[PDB]
Design an enzyme around this catalytic site. Structure first.
Site, PDB file in Angstrom:
ATOM      1  N   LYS A   1       1.414  62.148  16.986  1.00 57.92           N
ATOM      2  CA  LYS A   1       1.561  62.522  15.564  1.00 57.92           C
ATOM      3  C   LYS A   1       1.881  63.986  15.290  1.00 57.92           C
ATOM      4  O   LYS A   1       1.870  64.405  14.134  1.00 57.92           O
ATOM      5  CB  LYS A   1       0.352  62.062  14.725  1.00 57.92           C
TER       6      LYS A   1
ATOM      7  N   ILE B   1       3.191  54.318  14.907  1.00 56.19           N
ATOM      8  CA  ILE B   1       3.288  55.568  14.137  1.00 56.19           C
ATOM      9  C   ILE B   1       4.334  56.542  14.678  1.00 56.19           C
ATOM     10  O   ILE B   1       5.014  57.213  13.896  1.00 56.19           O
ATOM     11  CB  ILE B   1       1.902  56.268  13.982  1.00 56.19           C
ATOM     12  N   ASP B   2       4.436  56.638  15.998  1.00 51.77           N
ATOM     13  CA  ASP B   2       5.403  57.536  16.642  1.00 51.77           C
ATOM     14  C   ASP B   2       5.633  57.123  18.096  1.00 51.77           C
ATOM     15  O   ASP B   2       5.007  56.172  18.559  1.00 51.77           O
ATOM     16  CB  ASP B   2       4.958  59.004  16.494  1.00 51.77           C
ATOM     17  N   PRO B   3       6.537  57.812  18.820  1.00 51.44           N
ATOM     18  CA  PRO B   3       6.791  57.375  20.196  1.00 51.44           C
ATOM     19  C   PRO B   3       5.621  57.625  21.127  1.00 51.44           C
ATOM     20  O   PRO B   3       4.704  58.356  20.780  1.00 51.44           O
ATOM     21  CB  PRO B   3       7.986  58.235  20.628  1.00 51.44           C
TER      22      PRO B   3
END
Lengths: 218, 218
Positions: free
Chosen positions: A131, A67-69
């Site tokens: 997020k 979803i994200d780093p």
């Protein structure tokens, strides 16, 4: 490899030519949001946001997407942990260890596997807050993943809650698997067979399978 | 088993309780379009349009789906040819013969296999004209297949042109494979491994395989 300019940090984005059709849209969208997201300290740093755009897409058949780093220590390469400390890439490596039989290894990297492009849906997070930058990357994220799904034949997303609305967002005809997150509780990722299912789907579509052992670092 | 009334032929639709959540939408959608459908002579006849809604869904793990009924002689049961004359079911029977090793048989029926629900995406066509009622069934077809894909683990669509963008239109987490149409050229259906792979995918999803030999009629 060309480059484009953006008004805010990191000021220039260098990209592989396969990304050319989305870059003018990317510049526009990034100029709208960059001033807001850059007020936070980020993972990764701004100079690393876009380094994955240096990867070619035409030799890729699978996208593995988180979803994200990482909250902290993101390198700009999705899932990458140079010191092999991050839970997600450790659990992934253990899952591939069980599949392939390789038990002695020092690290694992999804970015050195033929046919695989590892991906982060959002390209940053406010440091330590998973997020937190969803509202800024929103349109860019859809733009870039849609472009990836024009090349790959299988999109594999990790995190059923994180990606619960991904299919409606993408409007893509591409095969999309949404598996458990590697840090999912009750050990559910360990019983996840998505890595195995990908190759079965590839071989049915007359594509070569992924050699997941290529990711190992010794 | 309950029933619901519609304004036009066939006037009453009897359905298995598993279908209950879509039936109020179905009567609405059917009442809007039934006059358009019924001006044409159809395959199947109007009294057979909805007989497949008598099948339960909760004991189903595979849907085998063709685009619409046979141009003539449709029975209301998808793929069914009582006299075993239709090319599609004969080619399917031949594929399952090569898979299972059963060589002596008089017919084949996809509607008598535990775990399988055979399906027609559009529920009628103008007599002798394939895909001639696509526009009228449109919303009903999406509604009904989306409901099937909440129950089944594997959706097997036959016809790569017919079903090119089915995954986009469904927005479903079901495993969807799009194989060649049984009547495809260059023997492409004969060499299709989709029936074989269905059981490999089911095992990966912790589901019992399909006993494809159950379809044979002796």
């Amino acid at each position: 490899m060309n480059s484009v300019t953006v008004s805010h940090a990191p000021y220039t984005i260098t990209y592989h030519n396969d990304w050319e059709p989305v870059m003018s849209q990317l510049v526009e969208f990034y100029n709208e949001v960059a001033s807001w997201l850059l007020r936070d300290e980020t993972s990764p740093i701004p100079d690393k946001f876009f380094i994955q755009l240096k990867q070619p897409l035409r030799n890729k058949r699978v996208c593995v997407c988180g979803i994200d780093p990482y909250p902290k220590d993101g390198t700009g390469v999705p899932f990458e942990s140079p010191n092999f400390t991050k839970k997600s890439i450790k659990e992934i490596a253990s899952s591939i260890s069980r599949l392939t039989g390789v038990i002695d290894y020092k690290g694992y990297n999804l970015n050195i596997i033929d046919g695989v492009i590892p991906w982060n849906y959002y390209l940053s997070c406010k440091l330590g807050e998973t997020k937190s930058h969803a509202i800024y990357w929103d349109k860019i994220s859809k733009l870039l993943l849609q472009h990836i799904t024009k090349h790959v034949s299988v999109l594999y997303c990790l995190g059923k809650t994180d990606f619960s609305n991904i299919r409606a967002k993408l409007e893509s005809p591409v095969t999309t698997i949404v598996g458990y997150h590697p840090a999912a509780r009750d050990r559910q990722f360990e019983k996840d067979r998505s890595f195995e299912i990908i190759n079965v789907l590839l071989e049915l579509d007359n594509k070569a399978p992924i050699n997941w052992a290529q990711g190992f670092i010794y």
